[PDB]
Amino acid sequence: ILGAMVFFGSAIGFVYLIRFTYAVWFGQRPSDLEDVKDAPLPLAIGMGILAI
Amino acid sequence: LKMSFDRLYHDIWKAIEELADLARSYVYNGNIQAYAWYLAIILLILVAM
Amino acid sequence: LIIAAILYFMGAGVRKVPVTDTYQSGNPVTMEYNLTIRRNFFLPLKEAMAFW
Amino acid sequence: YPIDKDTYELFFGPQHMATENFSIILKMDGNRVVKAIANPGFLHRGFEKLAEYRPWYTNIALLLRICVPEPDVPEAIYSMAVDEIIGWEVPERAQWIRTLVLEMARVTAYLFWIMGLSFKLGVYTAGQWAAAYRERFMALFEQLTGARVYHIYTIPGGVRRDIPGDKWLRQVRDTVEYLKDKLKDFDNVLFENYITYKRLEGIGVMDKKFALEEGVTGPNLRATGVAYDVRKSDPYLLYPELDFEIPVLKEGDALARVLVRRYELEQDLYIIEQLLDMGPPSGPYKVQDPKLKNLPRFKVPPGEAFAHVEATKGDFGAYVVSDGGHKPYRVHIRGPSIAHGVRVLEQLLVGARLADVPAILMSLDNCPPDIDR
Amino acid sequence: FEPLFNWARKKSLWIVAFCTGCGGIEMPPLMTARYDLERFGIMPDPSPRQYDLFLITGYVTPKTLKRIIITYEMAPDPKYVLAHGSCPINGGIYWDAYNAIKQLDKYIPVDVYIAGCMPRPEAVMDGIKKLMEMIENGEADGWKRYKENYEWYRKNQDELLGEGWREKEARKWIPWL
Amino acid sequence: EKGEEIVKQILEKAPYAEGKVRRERRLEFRVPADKIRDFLRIMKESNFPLMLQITAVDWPKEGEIELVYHLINVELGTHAMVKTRIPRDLDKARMPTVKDIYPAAETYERDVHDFFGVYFEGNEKMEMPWILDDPERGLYPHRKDFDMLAYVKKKYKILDRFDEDKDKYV
Amino acid sequence: FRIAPEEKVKKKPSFLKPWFGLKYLFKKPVTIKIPYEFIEPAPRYRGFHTLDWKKCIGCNMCGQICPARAIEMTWIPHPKIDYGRCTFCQFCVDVCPTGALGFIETYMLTTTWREEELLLYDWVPIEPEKFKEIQEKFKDYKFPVEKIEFNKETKEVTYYLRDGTTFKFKILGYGL
Amino acid sequence: IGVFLRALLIIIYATFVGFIFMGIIRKVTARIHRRIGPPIYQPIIDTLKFFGKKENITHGLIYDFGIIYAVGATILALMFIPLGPISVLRAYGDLILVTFLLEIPMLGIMFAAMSSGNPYAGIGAQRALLTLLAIQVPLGLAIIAVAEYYGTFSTYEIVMAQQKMGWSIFHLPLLLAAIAYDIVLQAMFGKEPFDIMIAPGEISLGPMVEFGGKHMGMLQIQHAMALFAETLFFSNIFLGGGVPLLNTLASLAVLLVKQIAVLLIAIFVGAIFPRFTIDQAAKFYWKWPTIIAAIGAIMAS
Ligand code: SF4
Ligand code: SF4
Numbered sequence A: 001i002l003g004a005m006v007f008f009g010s011a012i013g014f015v016y017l018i019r020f021t022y023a024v025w026f027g028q029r030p031s032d033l034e035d036v037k038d039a040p041l042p043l044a045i046g047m048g049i050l051a052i
Numbered sequence B: 001l002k003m004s005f006d007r008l009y010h011d012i013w014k015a016i017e018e019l020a021d022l023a024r025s026y027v028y029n030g031n032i033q034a035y036a037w038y039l040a041i042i043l044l045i046l047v048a049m
Numbered sequence C: 001l002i003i004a005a006i007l008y009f010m011g012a013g014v015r016k017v018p019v020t021d022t023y024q025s026g027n028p029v030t031m032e033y034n035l036t037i038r039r040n041f042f043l044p045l046k047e048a049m050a051f052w
Numbered sequence D: 001y002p003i004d005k006d007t008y009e010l011f012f013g014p015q016h017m018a019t020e021n022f023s024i025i026l027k028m029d030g031n032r033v034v035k036a037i038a039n040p041g042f043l044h045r046g047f048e049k050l051a052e053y054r055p056w057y058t059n060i061a062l063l064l065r066i067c068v069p070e071p072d073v074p075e076a077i078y079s080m081a082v083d084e085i086i087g088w089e090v091p092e093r094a095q096w097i098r099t100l101v102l103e104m105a106r107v108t109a110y111l112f113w114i115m116g117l118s119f120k121l122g123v124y125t126a127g128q129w130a131a132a133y134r135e136r137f138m139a140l141f142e143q144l145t146g147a148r149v150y151h152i153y154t155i156p157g158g159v160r161r162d163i164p165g166d167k168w169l170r171q172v173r174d175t176v177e178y179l180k181d182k183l184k185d186f187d188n189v190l191f192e193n194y195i196t197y198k199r200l201e202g203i204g205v206m207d208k209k210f211a212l213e214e215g216v217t218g219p220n221l222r223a224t225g226v227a228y229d230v231r232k233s234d235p236y237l238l239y240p241e242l243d244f245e246i247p248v249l250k251e252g253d254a255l256a257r258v259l260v261r262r263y264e265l266e267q268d269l270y271i272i273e274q275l276l277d278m279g280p281p282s283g284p285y286k287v288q289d290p291k292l293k294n295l296p297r298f299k300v301p302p303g304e305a306f307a308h309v310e311a312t313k314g315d316f317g318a319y320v321v322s323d324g325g326h327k328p329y330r331v332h333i334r335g336p337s338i339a340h341g342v343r344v345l346e347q348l349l350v351g352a353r354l355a356d357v358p359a360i361l362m363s364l365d366n367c368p369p370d371i372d373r
Numbered sequence E: 001f002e003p004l005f006n007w008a009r010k011k012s013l014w015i016v017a018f019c020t021g022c023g024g025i026e027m028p029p030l031m032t033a034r035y036d037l038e039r040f041g042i043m044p045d046p047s048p049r050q051y052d053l054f055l056i057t058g059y060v061t062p063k064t065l066k067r068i069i070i071t072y073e074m075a076p077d078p079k080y081v082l083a084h085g086s087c088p089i090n091g092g093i094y095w096d097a098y099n100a101i102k103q104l105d106k107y108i109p110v111d112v113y114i115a116g117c118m119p120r121p122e123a124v125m126d127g128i129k130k131l132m133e134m135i136e137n138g139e140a141d142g143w144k145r146y147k148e149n150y151e152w153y154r155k156n157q158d159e160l161l162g163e164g165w166r167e168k169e170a171r172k173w174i175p176w177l
Numbered sequence F: 001e002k003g004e005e006i007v008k009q010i011l012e013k014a015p016y017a018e019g020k021v022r023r024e025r026r027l028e029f030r031v032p033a034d035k036i037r038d039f040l041r042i043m044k045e046s047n048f049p050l051m052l053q054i055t056a057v058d059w060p061k062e063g064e065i066e067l068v069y070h071l072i073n074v075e076l077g078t079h080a081m082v083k084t085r086i087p088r089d090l091d092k093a094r095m096p097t098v099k100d101i102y103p104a105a106e107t108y109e110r111d112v113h114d115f116f117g118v119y120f121e122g123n124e125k126m127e128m129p130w131i132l133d134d135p136e137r138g139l140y141p142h143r144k145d146f147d148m149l150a151y152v153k154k155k156y157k158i159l160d161r162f163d164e165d166k167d168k169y170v
Numbered sequence G: 001f002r003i004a005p006e007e008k009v010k011k012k013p014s015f016l017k018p019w020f021g022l023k024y025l026f027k028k029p030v031t032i033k034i035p036y037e038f039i040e041p042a043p044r045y046r047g048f049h050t051l052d053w054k055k056c057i058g059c060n061m062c063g064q065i066c067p068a069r070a071i072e073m074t075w076i077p078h079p080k081i082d083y084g085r086c087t088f089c090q091f092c093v094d095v096c097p098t099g100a101l102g103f104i105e106t107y108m109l110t111t112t113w114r115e116e117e118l119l120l121y122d123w124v125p126i127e128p129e130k131f132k133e134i135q136e137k138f139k140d141y142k143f144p145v146e147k148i149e150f151n152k153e154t155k156e157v158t159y160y161l162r163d164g165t166t167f168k169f170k171i172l173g174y175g176l
Numbered sequence H: 001i002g003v004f005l006r007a008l009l010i011i012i013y014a015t016f017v018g019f020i021f022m023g024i025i026r027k028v029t030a031r032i033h034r035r036i037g038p039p040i041y042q043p044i045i046d047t048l049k050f051f052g053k054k055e056n057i058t059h060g061l062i063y064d065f066g067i068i069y070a071v072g073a074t075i076l077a078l079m080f081i082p083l084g085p086i087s088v089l090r091a092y093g094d095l096i097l098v099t100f101l102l103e104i105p106m107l108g109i110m111f112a113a114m115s116s117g118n119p120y121a122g123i124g125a126q127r128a129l130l131t132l133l134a135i136q137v138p139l140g141l142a143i144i145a146v147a148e149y150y151g152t153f154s155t156y157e158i159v160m161a162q163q164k165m166g167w168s169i170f171h172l173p174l175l176l177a178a179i180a181y182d183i184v185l186q187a188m189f190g191k192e193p194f195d196i197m198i199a200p201g202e203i204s205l206g207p208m209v210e211f212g213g214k215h216m217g218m219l220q221i222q223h224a225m226a227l228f229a230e231t232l233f234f235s236n237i238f239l240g241g242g243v244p245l246l247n248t249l250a251s252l253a254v255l256l257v258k259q260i261a262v263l264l265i266a267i268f269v270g271a272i273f274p275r276f277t278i279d280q281a282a283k284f285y286w287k288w289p290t291i292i293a294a295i296g297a298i299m300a301s
């Protein structure tokens, strides 16, 4: 009875991340994001450290 | 009270009763060669031992 | 992924296209059309367990 | 800059295979619809200022293409209207022939509506069967008059080619008895499964006061509480000596407007079986010899006439006015689907899910060559 | 290299189901249980990328010639349209129409014409069979004239209805939201 | 016969309603132009709910777009043809819309306004691209001031891919 | 008046009743293999035109009842029917007074994109010896003209038939 | 170097039998409503056509890598399930691995379907993800019912425990997981009752609405491997193939017969049943197959 909800949790863990990476990262861009730059370095060191 | 059990057992019996109309027409055909194929299938199982 | 790249990285014209010109049921679509969906994304999921 | 930011506008244009040829722009809200206006007229050939330039007899062949699924109901209404302004004496044989082809084109249009519904409801087997059994009706029409569809048959007086004989009239008995034994295998795929009944339940709730005053004239307001059948109310062709029974429900959701068309198929096939055992007596196929010659120069005395006839989707009328010469002054063909899937569809999709935009589109039998005219 | 793909094309022609108005009564029963096309492998799917056999079934309204040429701009290599009926040839009975577009070869490159009103599915079988015979050796068809001879079709596109449809049929709804 | 009783019952409730009864059920009558708006709901509330297409013929000799209005019955089966006569200029092409009583004329008036002439005042779906997009909306092609085969020549240069002269009439 | 049910039409949904649509897993599939099983169309299917050159009087009675305005007249004064704008309605058959415009079952006509194969649609229709191109020459039900060689300033069209006569004639002038 | 050639043997056999299995699906759905339909070697010619274009689309840098990752994941799915005795590895073919590696094709065929950017691809991904939400409620209970009935997870220690004793669609606490798998397989495939991640006709084509030449070819490869992997996972758990070359080839042949066996009952349901609204598809996989698999889960414990 407890293995079902945790497996359902892996499914619904899959689902919301698909919801995140869709309307934040793909599709068209609105015309107020043409004034944006890349990622700065000090956040990128933390990103690279956690990735490796 | 929207979830009764009178409805569910009538559902499961109507499913068995329409399966009774299902097995009537599938296995019991007028096709003579269908029964020949049934005999060849069970002979094939006797090959498989 | 290498054997998958073998069946893709074969050339024969990989010409890039813009995003604003897309399917839209075979129709013209301009830049001022909100085509990527961004509003709740899960309305049958909310209306399935609307009691919970 | 995308100026809505709330409601994405997907829209089923022509190349979609659910809608046939009319684009419905849907202001979608996530997975529902909050505003559903339609843009019809991808097919506007024009027939007001286009059928005004041909003579009176040759304006049949140009007028067939106003409704594609029924290739006899548009000619048999114009042939009924030019019958009135001249006042012919169309005999019993021509009346019987036009009756039987007006009912066999109607069962063809019902079969096409079944196939068109099943191509967008997922299940292909009820589509392939419906088109297969429509094809033998097409190959039976081809013995009689000409091509498969657009058989230019019913000239303003009578018909053009009579029956071949016992090779044909026995054949219609064969295919009608065959399809009446066949129709019990359409129920188990389209009307008895707990998918379709659970898919079309309660979607597009049409009220009782929302059908009679809206523009709806077909069999789909007959699923709402309305007692109106133009074959029963004012019989026109050899209808009064038939005694068929019409269906009326008190419902009005979408599957109410589908079961009524299934029962209409059953009773219409019973009509064609009942009409055949009568059999046509003798008579000519044309109407008159002297007032038909010099076929272009066909001066009709002035006046006007309205006719209207039952269809697969809507009791749709014609309006001919005659100036007094060899030109119809204005032939208006009222499409059945003008306020029957354009205006009533706007207040039917509001709230409905995206999966039941195509099913609602076919639960009214929307045929795009009728809105434009 | 080349005939390994050439035979592969003429066996799985995917048709896109535009169903262009009058004529979508002999487009379905062409591809159903009777006189069929899946025996030839002609499997329909409604996508403007996963097709290479467009059937311009009859007439073309200029409110549909926008949509047809937008669909025709998206099939990558082997797009070749099969004109149908008798509308694309010279205009059908709607030669007296301000709408219904006469003379379809002046707008998009037609490969093969059939005759008939409506054309019987046996005539469509003869049309596709002659299209197979044409595509065996490969016969400088459409997609090879829409590429090099684009200067003529783009001029004839822009002359009829023209002036950049991507602003006329896009801005036609944003006031009427 | 019964249609004569029906039109006699209608003529009690309206003076300007000269009713001619054709064959059995084709009850046709003409009303003045700016009086049908106070009249069509007499016809609605009596027995005729359902409204068919607002079909409008034209006349160049006497300039008037005779907008005939098709009504129908549901309890008897008759079909009214109440008709008006409004002037022919685009300045004078005015007609009050029947939307407060019939929601059937929400869409019929769009087609009769986009095809030729008439402008309907109290309606919202007027300048919508219903049908006949640009450049066909800029001139009304269904009246008798618009002739074919001199606009088609200005829209398409040749009408025959083939030979001699297949573009004239008769 | 004669309302049929009270709840007689509305049926009951059902779980496993769609398996009765599975009956045709073993019956013979109802299709026609078109290469090459022929169909044999109807004895009076509306098709192409078979004008008789000895009964035609040139009265242009057909000219005024063609709904698509393609039976335009030539001189040597017979009509050329073009199938560019023609709906096969066969109103030109029962209106021709002499009887010199028939119709025979021939509908298959496929031409390619080039103009030299598209002059094929402008034919002065030939005598009913073209019925000996529907029978006795490989009964394929196809248009037995199959190429046309127009020539500017030497206007002599040549219906190069299947194997028969080239059928040369001059065409000068059109209309009336 | 030998395990590389053996893995190449398994991937090229899975190609040249998975495409024939999809062609068998097309042939049976053709005969199910009275039509000859395509030849048996049909979708091989589909793939061979779709790699012969001269233009492509490539909307983005991720628009390529998502479906290429989908093909890599669906190849990784079939690499662990024991295709007969010839396995590149049989030490670790655990249930949770193969069960989750069927779902990762439903990422990459959709994760790169989002990069195009479309309301049709957006609402296709919307109607595809509620399946993968809803189907894992009876799927997990079927895996627990397989788990607690045996105990071991290394899938070579399951076909051994089948060929030692008993079949696996028998023994009713395990058969109630098979009916749950027989219902979840039509969704995991994309067959007609739970179709909606394909949806041909209602929506345009959902996720694969505009891909192009090469991308549809990779999709046909991925779809054939998704077919073969989920069918081989059902057969090497609930049926068991197990078992010299005249023994090995016949072992793979009777495995192929049991591949067709569940594939035969996947088609008969999957043509006489219309497409399902996704709001009811979320509601269906919690009512009937969940309580069936839950009764199986408490009878396997
Ligand atoms: S070719 Fe004939 S049938 Fe086809 S669209 Fe034109 S007029 Fe209609
Ligand atoms: S075949 Fe028909 S459309 Fe053509 S010219 Fe003759 S009557 Fe007119």
Ligand code: SF4
Pocket: G055, G056, G057, G058, G059, G060, G061, G062, G063, G077, G078, G079, G095, G096, G097, G098, G099, G100, G101
């Ligand atoms: S066929 Fe008839 S109408 Fe035509 S030219 Fe000959 S005689 Fe005159």
